[model samples]
Target chain A: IIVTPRYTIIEDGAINKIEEILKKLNLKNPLVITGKNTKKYCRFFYDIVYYDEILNNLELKKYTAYDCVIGIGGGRSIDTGKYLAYKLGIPFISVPTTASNDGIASPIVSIRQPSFMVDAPIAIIADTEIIKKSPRRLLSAGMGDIVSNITAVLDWKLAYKEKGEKYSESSAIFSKTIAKELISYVLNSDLSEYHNKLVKALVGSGIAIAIANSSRPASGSEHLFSHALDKLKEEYNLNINSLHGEQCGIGTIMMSYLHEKENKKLSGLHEKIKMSLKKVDAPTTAKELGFDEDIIIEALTMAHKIRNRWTILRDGLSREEARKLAEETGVI
Target chain B: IIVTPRYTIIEDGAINKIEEILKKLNLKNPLVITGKNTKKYCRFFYDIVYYDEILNNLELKKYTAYDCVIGIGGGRSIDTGKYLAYKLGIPFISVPTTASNDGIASPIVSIRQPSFMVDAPIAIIADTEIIKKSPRRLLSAGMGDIVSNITAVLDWKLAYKEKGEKYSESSAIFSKTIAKELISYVLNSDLSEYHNKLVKALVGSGIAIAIANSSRPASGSEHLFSHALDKLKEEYNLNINSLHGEQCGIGTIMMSYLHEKENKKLSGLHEKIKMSLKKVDAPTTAKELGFDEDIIIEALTMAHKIRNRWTILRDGLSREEARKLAEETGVI
Candidate 1:
């Protein structure tokens, strides 16, 4: 597939250039979708501003007049804009205020649509100045999303070697490289300097997914665990609220442990990831992600069923084994 | 450093969007550097259009008021613009009319300044429609440049392992992936539809150089061979003309052969590169590049001295060995 987002603008104060980006792409009359707090960054003129809404809540008839959709906030706002753009058959421009996840540029919309995948943004405007203004917790969580690619690519290679699945070497190398780069950057540099690296890594992850024609390169058993948590939280009416990347970050630590236990080549990777997560202040334990040991074990046991894709959690983990793995990895 | 060109537009008619890009970047006045024939592509409003000029010939004082510099044409025009921008301390936008080399997005200026590297373009507008309109030979040459990365990365790995040279794994993986992807694309698909892949690969090569913080990721022994031929031609006043990529393509074949002869792991790579070059109609022989076998042999013997970088050429090649390698790789 050709690259999405014919344009990608990543610099300080990138959002301020939105008017010109739209003009260059011939996108006039854009509808800006943003969060309540993030709407302040929308200093540029637009046809309308949408806030605090979901795909189901948006008034489709009223919003159909716009020529383009600009998602200019966190995940919820961007996903809403993406789905809206998909429904309206118009271009979607992503202007993420926070680097919370790869959704900043990914085609997959997991928040509102729940695993619905669509075309990526026609362009991406990641303003580091605005992203830096976000809470440090979000930055840490973004690091979690990026570092998770370590286990994801491992699982992908496992599938390719054992299960006869197709693999894109280019995508795998890029995703793995991005994860490793972020891991090293977080360890070597100060947290205050992570805005640029985090933003670039997030966008690079999205590109990897697009290149692979799926999320196999960026999402693996770790993502599966996150999805499992989402399902259990929804089904049992649990009050546990956590960012997707936060949960995935915790999953990455445990999943990496499993891979290292199985292969000597991957040894030390788990510790490396754990150290990076700690350095970035990302969630690494069950409690840190707002879930107890029982919840974490249950998610691990059922993670493989979250998707039919192959991963380290082959045939799903047994409850006994899951608890043992979690305990050994210090997730408990 | 972070990525340049807060924006990159690679669409079918990317040049048409230049006005909007300038507006977004707040570059109100631009002096476009282009060629006489290619100037037609610069239809956008600009403060001035300077054509058929070089660094030594340009009237600098008369061109100081422009807010930005736009390079829209082949190598000469873009290099001139890049050098001018360097001199004036302004942003340089690259709009390549042909994909003849990686200079379209690279920081290295090989034409005017010869090994002078600088900041990459502030933005790149690669209009496929304009690129497709160029001669087919240019496309073939572009593919040659991309495919030569196979030998480049191999040489890089050699340096990292044997000579203790620092290596950027991300840059190495990216450069190698781009080369392999282009080789496979040319072999599997028809040449009539290589515009998108070629352009993306060219841009990707530039990013690889930036990430590596040097040209080591994109240039190695093969590039040295090309540079050797360049010096020879200049000194001997040889009446031969060839595209940089075409000569480098032939150099890649011989270099890969040398690596394979030394290491079994790289056994079939030389033939793979040669086949890909043939498929894309890139020159894979000394005669195809308008140089005789004697010149090719001389270049091989003198290649290692072109740069201090380590490669398979280690300590320079003997005259007999260089001639044998050229003949075995079918470049003679």
Candidate 2:
């Protein structure tokens, strides 16, 4: 059966409930996987270990006796615990301290390895109090990721109908439903309320990805653009400080504009999405994410080649067309 | 892990392609399970067996040698083969001859037994030419089931929010998407063009039900009303000649009105659904389904008692309220 996180506690001081949470699941001898600084968040833990360094070749003998792995911290910590749990054939619990991205509950882990599929965590403990202490930039990035699901869903539907791609109607709907809910929250909620909503939204999106067995329902042209920008940064040795979701938010604005050109039903969607991102101070323009017009245009032009998935950017765009698309969507 | 129909052929003459389809799957010695009247439709089959007889205690020794089971005909025939395949731990292929209900691809079987969950079919061959020759009433019934998805989704959302019931966003959206598509088709397409669309829609709904592992995404207050009416008819020995989908269609009109009363967002939904049903000549009122006003009101008031499911009808309605609800929705 498809396994996903069944128990989720999203409240203030959820970290303090770790002992009782483990007891509730009849799990003992927990191994707390966390980053260097994040380890301090869970001081009252057993067999605490760091995930900042190499995780692929861990000293299994010392940690093998643990009944369960509790990932405490960010994506890196959670993913390390997730992978470890899979290898040990035990349940994993995720305790995310930041609303950064969807890796919080996703079955696909990426750290010292590429995107590797594994069973999702058995439970998630998202302490809003801890997450609220995180950098605000991370919360904005999370909103960027959540908002991109709109275009991601549209891209998946178009790919299925046009190219006969394997499609899961449930996955498409699940991802889109969360996206709509999160986008609406961004537009309407107070700034103080965005973190808890973003954390829950990211968790929901990750479950959608897990259910789909692919990121197609949560990543599309926007993700390709982000990946293209990453490649360009490494190739040019540029000092870009853009987060994955930050770049994705700007990409969503442009891709939504492109979809609107094809389907009139999506008219005004790009403008509304741009405003939603702006409401939460998410990066709506490439410049806001420390990217120049040249980088943005080049990324858009070559985004189609970044992945094999079919999206609005099915074919590589011309430099001129990419520049025009960026200008028309007000992304530049 | 969720095994649904892998290959579906919806051509006008898909029955003739069954041999090639079986060969493609590397299946040999298919035990053709069909109804007494449907046996003539597949005269060239091997090791044919009638499904109209007792199925629970089938002589497994004689049919144990078959590599695959091909269920041909209506819901009864397909359900019989579905159960047999599950019991034998073998793959099943569904070759539907009529667009009567979502049983064309649902994993849930409701023969002489209660709703029993099983693995969905491995393949589906829906010969539209054969379905085109079935009674028009069956097609109308299929549309009724399809249209009820709108109310079903609404009921599911309400149940999740009000009663904390288990909810699957993907299944809800998947069911609603097909319902909206089919309802739109009825409003836009010609009368002669609905059979193929209805068959595909039924298959889509069935898959949604399978994914949810429950019929919550397909059945709601409208379905409860239909079940309640069935009970009343049996108790009173009434001569009601309504199909399941037809009764569901009339129930939907009333339920949509009830939802609209609570949420103005669904203001014109009831009228639109009624018109869609009228377009296809499906029964939209109690009298149209051969039910008197008193029977309709009693069914509505007692619908909540038919199942433990949390729907809009969580508590039994008063007789006066039920009568007013039916009259307000134009169901009486």
Candidate 3:
């Protein structure tokens, strides 16, 4: 059985319900996890301790006095808080300030652990009021996450069949349904600004994780490169740059091309990626993500080893072959 | 948890393994549920007891002396054995002679009660040897069942969203992956024969049910109409001639048309359905199933109350609207 963290989306005055739950649970002192730039935006809660520092291993006993951890920013903050909660053995509520990645609804939290980025979180919670105030780029990342499933699921099937794994039909259906719904929502809704579609899509991402009982439904070849990019960011001492979904969008198109192998099937993929990147004004190339051809090749090589989930990357393609394919596919 | 039965694809020697399992389980005087044609086919099984007569109260009780029930023919025989086992509180094994529908994999056995048809089965066991020898039409039905999911899942999502039901991403993903695999298998293999696709597709359907923990992923508006058609056959004392998958295919198209109305998304549905029908020579119309216009109307109306699982018929239109749409779109 898979357990999903609590999630709420109320019209108005829903924050009161959250406060009530917190009070009822006797969570008196909450440690707020947010980006340093976001500290000025969060002043509603009284008796809150804000941590604007980078997400890493700090002496947890230093903040042992806190009763609970509440993530109050975007994906980074939520992931950070989730890891802290998991480590400290305390309850964590993910209060997503932005409709970014599905970090709000996922049970596993992505963490930066010196050399690698890994997932380890218990629960997630989202506050619509705060999400409404987030920038459009964050929502675009959420859309990217939702759309990636289209390619990810196909790759998952290839792996599942090749490995003779007991594939889950329901999980695949759920992921596709959410992807279709997200696509329909975007096509039908007004895309002039970020709105409920972003929030719903992000929630759908979390739901994808819950159904698959793993992050494989949401993460595939695309995410492997994204994780490598995260590692690259650390190596370069990059200052809190590039959103997760933006990098993932580029990764998704590349993977789609790799999976189809036919030019006709690759028809609308590049256009979709361009549109997604344009919506968020996100960087569209590996160079923009602070990586050159060599770094991209290195990331691609390391990505296949990140997880055992099957994709075209693992389908008889050597690192050299993949790098050549990546370059030829115009991913760079 | 849902339990799925498996069968290996071997020659006649494989029957020894099945017999060994049955003998080991001490099911020696097993009640064999099958048609008159199958009774002659089971002459080799000395331990099997055949009723020979039509299934009624008196004939059913004679088989009550047996330790277990074994369905030796097609869906009808398997369904009969399943219901008997269910009523007797004994184990049942479904040895499908044909891959007609996923009825063999599902726990629920479709039964024609005095007034209606209902489901009640515990387990199934499809012998590949027997399935390989059966008519190809049965296998075509299995492919129809597998393809039908693409449409069923969409209806399930519409219902899930409209009713605000808790959604599971895993279940949806699982279903879509199965559909995708089955489609790819058919497309790649270029096998026009139904038996090959049916066996693969039936297994896919079974997996879909196992993952969803319910029949929602496999059955939707299409199955409902098929069930109603079965009921109509029984009600009017007409000869049961139409195959379940063929009826389901017609029903699926109708549901697909209805689904297309929701947001007007009908990508490749028309061409795909037409091509699939052309390959199988399966009936895509009510007239082909020996149903008149009045009978079709009755079936559609009866389908509305078939099950609680939501569909476009249930969510998108009123009863009167559904009747009108069915008249307009149904294969007459």
**lDDT values of the candidates?**
0.83, 0.82, 0.63
Q: What's the CA error at residue B303 for candidate 1, in Å? A: 7.6
Output the lDDT of residue A68, model 3.
72
Better of 1 and 3 by lDDT: 1
Query: DockQ of candidates 1 onward, in order?
Result: 0.20, 0.10, 0.10
| Tens digit per residue, CA lDDT, model 1, A51-133 | 55555566568776898899989988888888888888777899999999998888787754248677778788999999998
Find the 10 residues in a row with the least total lDDT in model 1 chain A. A1-10
Off by over 4 Å in 2: A1-149, A152-175, A181-250, A257-293, A301-332, B55-59, B237-240, B292-294
Please give, for residues A1-332, the per-residue lDDT of candidate 2 as tens digits: 23455456778988887887676555778888899868779868388888866375665666668888999887778888888887787778899999988888777776632366787776788999999999888888888888788889899999999999877765788788888877776777676788987887888787777657688788889988988898899989999778888998889999999999998998999998889888888888877889889999999888998878899887878999999999998888
Please tell me which model should have the higher DockQ, number 1 or number 2.
Answer: 1
Clashes of each: 2, 0, 27
Residue-wise lDDT of candidate 1 within B35-130, one digit each (tens)? Answer: 887877877657545555555575577777887899998877888788788778777889999998888887887753248787777778899999
CA error at residue A85 for candidate 3, angstroms: 2.1
In model 1, which runs have C-alpha deviations exceeding 4 angstroms?
A: B1-144, B151-171, B180-221, B224-246, B253-290, B297-332
Please give the ranking of all candidate structures by DockQ, highest first, separated by commas.
1, 3, 2
Error of 1 at B26 (Å): 23
